[PDB]
């Protein structure tokens, strides 16, 4: 059987799969806000 | 902000999107087991 540790982990990963240009060592997530990986906004 | 009612609802729906031939009035789900929509096994 699964635990809520595994359920919330899979819930974030299915939201992490919407990231254009995803990362590997991600920051700690925030369940109260959406999760968007940092897209390239070219300043230089 | 979201509630766990909305989180577990979206978790099942992202698992319901793997259904070959999904349904509309689905049965009540079971969080402890996987969810597979009934595929056609032709008997007749």
List the SSEs and their pairings:
The structure is cut from a larger assembly and holds two copies of chain A (44 residues).
Chain A lengths: L3 H13 L28
List its traits.
part of a larger assembly; 2 chains; 44 residues; mainly alpha
- Helical percent range of chain A? 25-40%
- Quick one: which chains have the greatest interface? A-B, 9 and 9 residues
Shape of chain A: elongated
What letter string, H or E per element, gives the SSE order of chain A?
H
Structural class of chain A: mainly alpha
How far the N terminus sits from the C terminus of chain A, by CA atoms, comes to 50 Å
The tally of beta strands of chain A, per DSSP, is 0
Number of helices of chain A: 1
Q: Which band does the percent of strand residues of chain A land in?
A: under 5%
Organism (chains A, B): Homo sapiens
Family (chains A, B): Belongs to the VPRBP/DCAF1 family.
Protein name (chains A, B): DDB1- and CUL4-associated factor 1
Subcellular location (chains A, B): Cytoplasm; Nucleus; Cytoplasm, Cytoskeleton, Microtubule organizing center, Centrosome
Describe, in plain words, how this protein is organized in 3D:
The structure is cut from a larger assembly and holds two copies of chain A (44 residues). By secondary structure, chain A is mostly helical. Helices cover 30% and strands 0% of the residues of chain A. Chain A has one helix and no strands. The interface between A and B is small, with 9 and 9 residues. The PDB classes it as transferase/dna binding protein/viral protein. The entry lists the keywords E3 ligase, HIV accessory protein. CryoEM structure of DDB1-VprBP-Vpr-UNG2(94-313) complex.
């Amino acid at each position: 059987p699964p635990t809520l540790d595994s359920i919330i982990t899979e819930y974030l990963r299915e939201q992490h799969a919407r990231c254009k240009n995803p990362v590997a060592t991600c920051p700690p997530f925030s369940l109260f806000t959406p999760h968007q990986c940092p897209e390239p906004k070219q300043r230089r």
